[PDB]
């Protein structure tokens with residue numbers, strides 16, 4: 126078997142390949158010592174590593190391993206998955222929404238990093254905890270789906286009131302900008318969580334559409350584990366991408382783009 | 392006497408002009424009735440209005456007023472202030488960081504809107520309230536000034552455990568992304584608020600430097616009341632603009648750009 130691993134700040138993504146059969150595994154970065162243990166017990170023909178925690182794995186295993194930069198690996202795996210799933214895109218921004226968010230422009234042949242921002246899944250988890258005391262990711266995201274952002278977020282129409290706004294009225298003008306107007310409100314953990322996902326999604330999307338414009342592409346591919354068990358995030362991002370005239374794409378096993386990619390840079 | 396009013400989502404900025412010479416005043420948008428009361432008693436030669444709540448003013452006063460579109464008014468007034476303050480910038484991005492944030496490219500002749508985002512002053516107050524239960528603006532902003540983001544934000548160097556990161560290790564990787572690694576103890580209001588100000592600054596700067604690259608300018612002018620009583624915000628923004636190879640500018644009475652521009656539009 127051949128093994129690729131993308132050991133990130135929060136999740137370890139492990140792909141095992143033998144024959145044309147794949148295994149897609151996810152483990153916590155917290156449990157990296159168990160991954161190393163597991164690896165040390167296997168018969169591995171080829172091990173390729175990428176990610177911020179690649180070094181940790183490499184120093185604790187008993188076999189050589191090639192180490193790749195995660196931007197190249199993500200770009201390589203993503204192209205493999207897009208092709209498999211019938212997306213033949215001439216060029217695209219891809220936004221990798223992990224613990225943090227990294228943006229890339231794929232010109233049809235190779236990637237360049239064109240921005241990043243700290244709004245991503247780590248913010249969903251951290252700010253989400255400060256606002257709900259929930260630490261369990263499934264718990265946090267499930268609850269967020271039951272939330273309403275309306276007493277938290279301010280829209281363009283709330284600011285322009287009964288006059289014609291300069292951009293469409295239903296757009297968010299100020300995330301959390303209605304809070305001071307609803308202090309009669311209680312602010313439910315579900316509503317607060319939905320607003321945190323809301324801001325993360327909007328910021329990622331805004332950045333993605335901006336660079337799409339700059340690098341003259343209409344296609345935006347979103348990957349990263351932050352979309353898992355988070356239909357609200359998927360929806361925020363998808364709707365706003367379409368609204369600004371771009372085409373969003375999600376990819377089956379997109380969160381493993383880097384793990385796959387590592388295998389095929391070797 | 393001539394009056395220009397920028398009536399936004401949180402604050403109403405008033406410029407009074409007489410012998411070529413100006414007086415600046417702000418009032419809360421929540422106290423708009425008091426602004427209307429003040430206008431109705433005044434003999435005014437020329438009254439010009441802009442911003443979201445210009446409608447509400449115009450429909451409650453008992454005199455005429457001319458209404459101008461805010462994007463144009465802000466551009467006109469910022470060009471006046473820049474020259475009065477000894478700048479000769481051929482072109483620039485301007486980021487108007489109000490209740491929310493609007494971004495513009497000024498080519499030397501006219502402005503174009505080139506994006507926006509809901510991260511700005513409204514988010515600082517609303518998210519800041521949610522994490523701190525402070526509603527008083529000067530109190531909320533003062534509380535943040537000496538906060539420590541270290542237990543709250545995750546940096547690139549935290550994810551890249553002992554290995555060399557592919558981008559600068561001191562960059563924020565995930566705002567709030569260190570929170571789950573610091574559950575042992577309490578998160579103080581100062582530290583949480585410094586983190587709020589940091590995410591707003593970094594998002595606004597990220598957008599501003601992206602569009603500066605896109606439109607080929609190294610100049611970025613930052614306006615809006617969100618910078619008032621918030622030295623930390625100014626610093627987050629200035630430091631990262633400079634690290635991205637751009638030149639940041641703040642303007643005395645920059646928050647009155649629209650009010651001034653309304654007076655000088657024809």
Ligand SMILES: Nc1ncnc2c1ncn2[C@@H]1O[C@H](COP(=O)(O)OP(=O)(O)O)[C@@H](O)[C@H]1O
Nearest residue numbers: 133134135136223224246247262349350351353
């Ligand atoms: N089982 C899970 N546990 C924790 N976080 C998860 C899980 N599934 C998805 N997530 C989301 O995915 C994020 C990490 O995305 P990922 O793309 O794996 O990033 P990284 O490579 O930086 O670890 C988390 O910050 C969280 O928002």
Ligand SMILES: Nc1ncnc2c1ncn2[C@@H]1O[C@H](COP(=O)(O)OP(=O)(O)O)[C@@H](O)[C@H]1O
Nearest residue numbers: 399400401402489490512513528615616617619
């Ligand atoms: N006295 C104040 N009261 C409330 N907010 C203030 C005050 N001074 C500055 N601010 C900040 O300025 C932000 C609004 O900036 P401004 O440029 O006036 O926006 P708008 O035109 O949308 O009112 C507020 O959201 C708050 O962050």
Ligand SMILES: CCCCCNC(=O)CCNC(=O)[C@H](O)C(C)(C)C
Nearest residue numbers: 225226227241242243562563564593
């Ligand atoms: C100080 C403002 C800096 C905000 C910009 N930050 C970034 O570009 C890093 C965002 N994070 C990411 O790209 C990913 O989490 C990696 C893993 C660090 C590549």
Ligand SMILES: CCCCCNC(=O)CCNC(=O)[C@H](O)C(C)(C)C
Nearest residue numbers: 296297298327491492493507508509
């Ligand atoms: C659905 C996500 C939309 C995010 C983009 N939102 C915007 O561009 C509105 C940002 N706000 C502003 O530009 C200002 O607050 C005004 C006053 C609405 C012009």
